[PDB]
């Protein structure tokens, strides 16, 4: 681990992670229900930390779209956030992955996707890496 500072004199812990995202290497993972709230996702993003919006709190693309739009309205221009989807909830994936693809194609500030509660197959992971327009992919091996 290293220290680095920017022009403004802000010090960062410098790791492989912090060097990618330009923020402290500290994240609030997706939690149903704690990070389903757009207000908490926005507060943490505005604090300068990476947080996953929990898909576990959402049942359709429309409901998750309204939550994402609420986060985007409350975060500063140039801020980003991630989405946590649950791999053992095939229904969530079925509306969740097309939604992220579509919002990323519209340029929504979704930096990454974390898949909780299972690791996708090589074929599925390839689809997520190549099609979703994400900076990185979060995996949570058990």
């Amino acid at each position: 681990p290293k220290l680095i500072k920017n022009k403004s004199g802000k010090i960062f812990v410098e790791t492989k992670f912090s060097k990618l995202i330009g923020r402290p290497p500290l994240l609030v993972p997706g939690m149903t229900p704690c990070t389903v709230s757009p207000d908490f996702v926005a507060a943490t993003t505005n604090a300068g930390y990476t947080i996953e919006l929990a898909g576990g709190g959402y049942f359709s693309a429309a409901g998750m779209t309204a939550a994402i739009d609420s986060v985007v309205s409350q975060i500063e221009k140039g801020s980003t956030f991630g989405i946590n989807l649950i791999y053992v909830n095939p229904f969530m994936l079925q509306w969740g992955i097309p939604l992220i693809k579509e919002l990323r194609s519209k340029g929504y500030p979704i930096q990454f996707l974390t898949i909780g509660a299972g690791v996708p197959s090589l074929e599925v992971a390839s689809e997520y890496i190549e099609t979703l327009g994400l900076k990185y992919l979060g995996l949570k091996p058990g």
């Binding site: 920017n6 812990v13 912090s18 330009g22 402290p24 604090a47």
Partner: protein, 130 residues
């Protein structure tokens, strides 16, 4: 460790980061903030000469081309050529500077004042009617 109710998320996350900074500063930088290296901006790093001229060919490597145009120093020109995305209000779109300077046969990029960021000029020249 969950003891203090209604601590702002900023105080919790900052408290952890500032704790790490303090401990690294003591252990690895002799309690001296002046030994911390500075960069213009921190981020955008994938985990994997004053006057110059670059000529694109059919076989020119895209990553090597953009590294060369970017330069070594972290400044506006590094961001211009290596950021995959730029911001349009709150949206994140593909870096248009990378699209425009995508290398192809006939493209000639002259960098002038490459060492002084404030004065650097990157000039793309292409064949126009011969």
């Amino acid at each position: 460790f969950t003891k203090v109710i209604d601590e702002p998320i900023k105080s919790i996350m900052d408290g952890i980061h500032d704790g790490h900074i303090k401990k690294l500063l003591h252990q690895y930088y002799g309690d001296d903030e002046s030994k911390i290296p500075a960069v213009e901006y921190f981020g955008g790093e994938s985990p994997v000469e004053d006057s110059a001229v670059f000529k694109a060919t059919s076989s020119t490597d895209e990553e090597s081309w953009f590294k060369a145009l970017a330069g070594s120093e972290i400044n506006w020109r590094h961001a211009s050529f290596l950021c995959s995305f730029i911001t349009q209000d709150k949206m994140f779109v593909s870096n248009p500077i990378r699209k425009v300077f995508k290398p192809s046969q006939g493209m000639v990029v002259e960098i002038s004042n490459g060492n002084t960021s404030s004065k650097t000029v990157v000039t793309l020249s292409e064949p126009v009617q011969g």
